[PDB]
């Protein structure tokens, strides 16, 4: 190829994600030449964030396009799939204080403080949790979201991902990270992933060196929850995922819109976290839309049957009106 083409959204944090995967794509491939495209992208709407990059794979104008997992849909159009699952970085949602308010939590913010969150999945649970605070939408990327917390005293706090505030290199803003009975994150969260055309087999023979086990198996389990619920954007869909002691445990839950009806539940399996690679058969089919030919099938399978398995829990306790009366309200 004499040279791979890694496409990406023009962000400030989606460069800085591109440019941390082709880092660790030099690592293992140094002195293979890499080039990075960047280009400019844009209810409703399924795939915001994915459908001009696809289509510049799709052109072969790229070869591989990273992306922050949880913006990949759990069903990706059929000549795309995911051929790495990066280590992940720290899923959980995290807390930024107005500088007034260094030293809280949201636990102890005066009542009726207003915190900042654009996110149904968010508003949802902090709502149940805190219902005495205002969750109230705001609007921008991650400097304009600080800038009207620091300045125009409307809000106490604002809500955003750790890995976010991290990866933009604010850490000490991070004030607070919420544990999953706070709020759990989204279905890949933290976790990066790298889009391919699904069978160009030497760039997924490349990127296969990403996948991280651990968090491939955690990721197909999240993905695999949310998929057989068919969640989408419009109705708060969340999830935590451990694997200790040879368990993968899967907690999952759905929320109405105010977080004032919740289902959650949690379900285990025995995995074995595969230290082996190989070199798997090219026609066994992706799992929820992920290519890990590279990495022991056996575990990924059990891993998205613990996902479907939480998912028919779930709907045999009421989800799915749950679900319905959601996304009744666009």
């Given at each position: 190829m004499r040279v791979i083409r890694v496409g990406t959204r023009k962000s400030q944090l989606a460069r800085i994600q591109t440019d941390s995967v082709v880092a660790t794509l030099k690592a293992s491939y140094p002195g293979l030449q890499f080039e990075i495209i960047a280009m400019s992208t844009t209810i409703g709407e399924k795939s915001l964030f994915t459908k001009e990059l696809e289509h510049a794979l799709e052109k072969n104008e790229v070869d591989l396009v990273v992306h922050s997992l949880k913006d990949l849909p759990t069903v990706l159009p059929p000549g795309f799939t995911i051929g790495a699952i990066c280590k992940r970085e720290n899923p959980h949602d995290a807390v930024v204080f107005h500088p007034k308010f260094v030293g809280k939590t949201l636990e102890t913010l005066p009542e009726k403080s207003v915190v900042g969150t654009s996110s149904l999945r968010r508003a949802a649970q902090l709502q149940r949790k805190f219902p005495h605070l205002e969750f109230r939408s705001i609007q921008g990327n991650l400097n304009t979201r600080l800038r009207k917390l620091d300045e125009q005293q409307e809000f106490s706090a604002i809500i955003l991902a750790t890995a976010g505030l991290q990866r933009m290199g604010w850490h000490n803003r991070v004030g607070q990270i919420l544990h999953p009975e706070e709020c759990m994150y989204a279905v890949g969260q933290g976790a990066l992933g790298v889009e391919v055309?699904?069978?160009?087999?030497?760039?997924?023979?490349?990127?296969?060196?990403?996948?991280?086990?651990?968090?491939?198996?955690?990721?197909?389990?999240?993905?695999?929850?949310?998929?057989?619920?068919?969640?989408?954007?419009?109705?708060?869909?969340?999830?935590?995922?451990?694997?200790?002691?040879?368990?993968?445990?899967?907690?999952?839950?759905?929320?109405?819109?105010?977080?004032?009806?919740?289902?959650?539940?949690?379900?285990?399996?025995?995995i074995h976290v595969p230290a082996q690679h190989e070199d798997g058969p090219e026609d066994d089919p992706q799992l929820v839309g992920i290519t890990a030919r590279n990495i022991p099938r056996g575990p990924q399978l059990a891993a998205q049957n613990l996902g479907i398995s939480l998912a028919n829990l779930l709907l045999s306790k009421g989800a799915k009106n749950i679900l319905d009366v959601a996304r009744q309200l666009n």
């Open positions: 055309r699904a069978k160009d087999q030497d760039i997924l023979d490349l990127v296969g060196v990403l996948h991280d086990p651990e968090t491939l198996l955690r990721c197909i389990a999240e993905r695999a929850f949310l998929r057989h619920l068919e969640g989408g954007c419009s109705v708060p869909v969340a999830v935590h995922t451990a694997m200790k002691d040879g368990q993968l445990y899967l907690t999952g839950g759905v929320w109405s819109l105010d977080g004032s009806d919740s289902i959650q539940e949690t379900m285990q399996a025995t």
